[PDB]
Curated annotation (Swiss-Prot), chain A:
Domain of life: Eukaryota
GO MF: guanyl-nucleotide exchange factor activity; protein dimerization activity
Subunit structure: Component of the biogenesis of lysosome-related organelles complex-3 (or BLOC-3), a heterodimer of HPS1 and HPS4. HPS1 cannot but BLOC-3 complex (heterodimer of HPS1 and HPS4) can interact with the GTP-bound form of RAB9A and RAB9B. HPS1 and BLOC-3 complex do not interact with the GDP-bound form of RAB9A and RAB9B.
One Pfam family per UniProt: Fuz_longin_3
Source organism: Homo sapiens (Human)
Gene Ontology CC entries for this record: BLOC-3 complex; cytoplasm; cytoplasmic vesicle; cytosol; lysosome
Coiled-coil ranges (or none): none
Descriptive protein name: BLOC-3 complex member HPS1
UniProtKB/Swiss-Prot annotation, chain B:
Pfam family, one: Intu_longin_3
UniProt keyword annotation of Ion transport present: no
Disease listed for this protein: Hermansky-Pudlak syndrome 4: A form of Hermansky-Pudlak syndrome, a genetically heterogeneous autosomal recessive disorder characterized by oculocutaneous albinism, bleeding due to platelet storage pool deficiency, and lysosomal storage defects. This syndrome results from defects of diverse cytoplasmic organelles including melanosomes, platelet dense granules and lysosomes. Ceroid storage in the lungs is associated with pulmonary fibrosis, a common cause of premature death in individuals with HPS.
Highest taxon in the source lineage: Eukaryota
Single GO BP term: platelet dense granule organization
Protein's UniProt name: BLOC-3 complex member HPS4
Lineage: Eukaryota, Metazoa, Chordata, Craniata, Vertebrata
Source organism of the structure: Homo sapiens
């Protein structure tokens, strides 16, 4: 009894995802058969029609509807010119879960498409191709992505807390590093058959945990947010070979190519390359932002007859724009640029404010068209250039030999990475604990395997902690049932000295997959103390109700110190 | 910003076709000085959204929330009730307030369909305006948060007078009030608020007005509208209110009871009439009583106290198995404990760095809460 729908202002459906119960209910209601998308559109048209009028008149939009006892929950969100609708009817997900799912879907759209998602006209065509087979294939791929995301959120702690988990083995990690360096990146780079593709990063994945990672000397460090999406994409194809997929990640949204080569069951290898025409996207992004500032002051400011021509920003934008036009020389964009050059810089007849607004809008769409023609039609899934088949086979076969003797040990160690017993003696009464570093995005937590009862209580603490953090509360201690929960937030420096606490701003959802909230929090504190480094830490612990509160705090503090000394 | 913003009724029978204007479908609206276009737009949008959600989900919606506003909607036959709230308010508080307004309308004017089919619009509109004025005059912060009532050998005889009345023929329950201060009452708290908020504006100073009690309240009085009669008597400072029966329209019995004690009640009345270091709030779930120590002037510290209770009050109503909850920020910490009988909230009016020290004063509020509150008679078990 679930449904996720994306619709435009004209009640046109672009993407839908329904389960068996919703489809059966719709069949029963409308069967007293047309396409499911048509039925959903004709059923949900009034909401879409009524939503726009509210924004047009009172500058307000509906956010959520609620029924008695919370039987049905409706969530609405306007992402630019598109409306996102989430429907729940089985009490399994709350409003926050639906909002997080919508934000995850929007982030997936960003990763899959790029800067094109900003333009509402092109995204409608991209999500609804004229060809039926391509549309069906894309819809099935996105439905599979949503299903695997939902499964991973309910089975894995890594997506439950949105943090990176690593397998600790000093002997194996080193050998993995030299094996990767010698036989993957160097093998691809030194091969003359690479066809201009440059290898940057390559990592080995076991289950939902990271084992080794290496980067080239000419590559930028990946943000922790992108690697969670990479892990989700890898898990979708091979749940616990397919052609390369074009992906976009923050370095802008520079293009990248994805390669997935499986080694065994539960062990996968991921390789990433970069197109030689990559820095063209940076120029396009600067031009995309440059015209936005020009349009911003065209509406707010006075008559643009003479004021804009003296602005250094316009001159800087002109110095950037004319260089781009001369370097390209495209007839379609040169004629419009000359038309806008005459309008903006004529000493006799400057363009009108209304006329200049339409001229700037036309140039905005043309720049996105060049990006679409360059970094999305040349995707490797549509016949684009890619690594040859035998080159991929050589890497896959050669990496297997280096890890042949460590197959059985890796699987056993993965299920028993951290033992709770090893901490029972030092910290009696402890049941479960989650240690997450918000600076590097890494988490330290044992492997949970009565077992279901404690497993369910883990999500309750996580959901409650996020809700209270949003309104400016840094800590939360509460007892529910026979267990005692905890949540702690504090700031430290690189050397380990204590730092003072400031007022957290009161409020986008809290997380790292669909955006970020911790990076902006660190910058806010650094504004007042630029001379000191800032680090962020979190700690979730579960204790029995028998332990007193005073003893609980001392036990929690000792655990954090021991983990800090064990790390680094 | 006012917590209570909008309140209007829509009738779907008068507007059935697309060409029928929705202006005639508005029976009442507050404020009355607003423009007509906004009225029509809001009514049409709300009615359309409610109808569409009811059609899709086979159940009418009970809450519509926007970025700046929050609407509580309930359906009663062909009439639609819409309530205007603020974002900061809890949803349960708005639902209870809307239910209270509906109950007041039913107990004051009977069924809506019969009242609008028999009576004119202007008189009910004036009554609504006056009653909204009273309700807006009688609202406070803790009353917004908890929705409680607007509330000793002398009390013994004051209640004995009522006890002698209950025996007096055809009596269910009664109460005695002094300028909004409760002396002794036997009615349920839901109807006690209705009697107390009744603006007190044949023997002299004797008035009898029929009322309409719901079956659940009528059963409670005896232990879906039922007609009863309210006896209102105006004294210099005292008021006596009795709900007896439908054919009340006994005689000379209640007349003698007051005049046998008028010189004693007023004489007893005139005899009666003639830097906090911590904040606390105690709420009784059974009697819906509220008592706390907050200054009339909202200091910046007091404003932060009200916000903390807002989230914590709603958390208890959703998790019946949750007992203890404490929070702390960069400036303050608030403790809470809940049992199926009563709730308690404590804050100290007197900055954490790094991981919390076990000797932190914020984490030791449990011991201080039970000891400090015993002074004002607040008995914590």
């Amino acid at each position: 009894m679930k449904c996720v729908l994306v619709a435009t202002e004209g009640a046109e459906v672009l993407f839908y995802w329904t389960d068996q119960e919703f489809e059966e209910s719709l069949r029963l209601k409308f069967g007293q058969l047309p396409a499911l998308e048509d039925q959903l559109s004709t059923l949900l048209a009034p909401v879409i029609i009524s939503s726009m009028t509210m924004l047009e008149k009172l500058s307000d939009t509906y956010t959520c509807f609620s029924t008695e006892n919370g039987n049905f929950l409706y969530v609405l969100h306007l992402f630019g010119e598109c409306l996102f609708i989430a429907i729940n009817g089985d009490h399994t997900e709350s409003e926050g879960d639906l909002r997080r799912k919508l934000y995850v879907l929007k982030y997936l759209f960003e990763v899959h498409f790029g800067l094109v998602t900003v333009d509402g006209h092109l995204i409608r065509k991209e999500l609804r191709p004229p060809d039926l087979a391509q549309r069906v294939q894309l819809w099935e791929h996105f439905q599979s992505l949503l299903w695997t995301y939902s499964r991973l959120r309910e089975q894995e702690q890594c997506f439950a807390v949105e943090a990176l988990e690593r397998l600790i083995h000093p002997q194996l990690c080193e050998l993995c590093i030299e094996a990767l360096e010698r036989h993957v990146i160097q093998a691809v780079n030194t091969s003359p058959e690479r066809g201009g593709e440059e290898a940057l990063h390559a990592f080995l994945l076991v289950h939902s945990k990271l084992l080794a990672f290496y980067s080239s000397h000419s590559a930028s460090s990946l943000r922790p947010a992108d690697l969670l999406a990479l892990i989700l994409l890898v898990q979708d194809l091979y749940p616990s070979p397919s052609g390369p997929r074009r992906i976009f990640l923050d370095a802008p949204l520079v293009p990248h190519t994805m390669y997935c080569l499986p080694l065994w069951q539960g062990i996968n290898l991921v390789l990433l390359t970069r197109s030689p025409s990559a820095p063209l996207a940076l120029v396009l992004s600067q031009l995309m932002d440059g015209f936005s500032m020009l349009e911003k002051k065209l509406k707010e400011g006075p008559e643009p007859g003479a004021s804009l021509r003296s602005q250094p920003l316009v001159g800087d934008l002109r110095q950037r724009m004319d260089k781009f036009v001369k370097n390209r020389g495209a007839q379609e964009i040169q004629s419009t640029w000359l038309e806008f050059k005459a309008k903006a810089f004529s000493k006799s007849e400057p363009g009108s404010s209304w006329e200049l607004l339409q001229a700037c809008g036309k140039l905005k769409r043309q720049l996105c068209a060049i990006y679409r023609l360059n970094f999305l039609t040349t995707a490797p899934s549509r016949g684009g250039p890619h690594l040859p088949q035998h080159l991929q086979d050589q890497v896959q076969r050669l990496m297997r030999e280096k890890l042949t003797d460590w197959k059985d040990f890796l699987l056993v160690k993965s299920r028993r990475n951290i033992t709770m017993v090893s901490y029972l003696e030092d910290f009696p009464g402890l049941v479960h604990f989650i240690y997450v570093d918000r600076t590097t995005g890494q988490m330290v937590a044992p492997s949970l395997n009565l077992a279901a009862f404690v497993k369910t209580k883990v999500w309750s603490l996580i959901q409650l902690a996020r809700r209270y953090l949003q309104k400016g509360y840094t800590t939360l201690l509460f007892q529910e049932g026979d267990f005692y929960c905890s949540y702690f937030l504090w700031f430290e420096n690189d050397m380990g000295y204590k730092l003072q606490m400031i007022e957290v701003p009161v409020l986008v959802p809290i997380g790292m997959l669909g955006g970020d909230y911790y990076r902006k929090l660190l910058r806010y504190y650094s504004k007042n103390r630029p001379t000191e480094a800032v680090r962020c830490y979190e700690l979730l612990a579960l204790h029995l109700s028998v332990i007193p509160t005073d003893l609980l705090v001392q036990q929690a503090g000792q655990l954090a110190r021991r983990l800090w000394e064990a790390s680094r | 910003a006012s917590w209570w913003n909008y309140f209007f009724l829509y009738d779907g029978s008068k507007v059935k076709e697309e060409g029928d204007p929705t202006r005639a479908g508005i029976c009442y609206f507050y404020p009355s000085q607003t423009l007509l276009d906004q009225q029509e737009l809001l009514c049409g949008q709300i009615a359309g959204v409610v109808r569409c959600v009811s059609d899709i989900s086979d159940s009418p919606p009970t809450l519509v929330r926007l970025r700046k506003l929050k609407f509580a909607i309930k359906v009663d036959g062909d009439y639609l009730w819409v309530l205007g709230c603020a974002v900061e308010l809890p949803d349960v508080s708005c639902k209870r307030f809307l239910d209270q307004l509906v109950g007041f309308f039913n107990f004051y004017n009977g069924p809506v369909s019969l009242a609008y089919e028999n009576c004119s619009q202007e008189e009910l509109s004036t009554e609504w305006d006056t009653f909204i004025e009273q309700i807006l005059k009688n609202t406070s912060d803790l009353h917004k948060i908890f929705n409680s009532l607007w509330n000793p050998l002398l009390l013994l005889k004051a209640a004995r007078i009522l006890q002698t009345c209950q025996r007096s023929p055809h009596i269910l329950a009664g109460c005695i009030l002094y300028k909004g201060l409760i002396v002794s009452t036997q009615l349920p708290p839901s109807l006690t608020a209705k009697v107390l908020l009744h603006r007190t504006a044949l023997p002299p100073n004797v008035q009898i007005i029929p009322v309409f009690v719901t079956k659940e309240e009528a059963i409670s009085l005896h232990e879906g509208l039922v007609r009863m009669n309210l006896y209102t008597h105006c004294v210099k400072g005292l008021v006596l209110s009795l709900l007896a029966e439908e054919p009340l329209l006994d005689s000379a019995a209640i007349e003698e009871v007051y005049h046998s004690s008028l010189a004693s009640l007023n004489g007893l009345e005139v005899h009666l009439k003639e830097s906090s270091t911590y904040n606390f709030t105690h709420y009784d779930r059974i009697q819906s009583l509220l008592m706390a120590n907050l200054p009339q002037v909202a200091t910046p510290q007091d404003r932060r106290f009200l916000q903390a209770v807002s989230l914590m009050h709603s958390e208890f109503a959703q998790l019946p198995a949750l007992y203890e909850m404490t929070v702390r920020n960069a400036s303050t910490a608030v403790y809470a404990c809940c049992n199926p009988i009563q709730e308690t909230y404590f804050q100290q009016l007197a900055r954490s760095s790094g991981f919390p020290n076990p000797q932190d004063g914020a984490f030791s509020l449990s011991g201080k809460a039970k000891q400090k509150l015993l002074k004002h008679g607040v008995n914590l078990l």
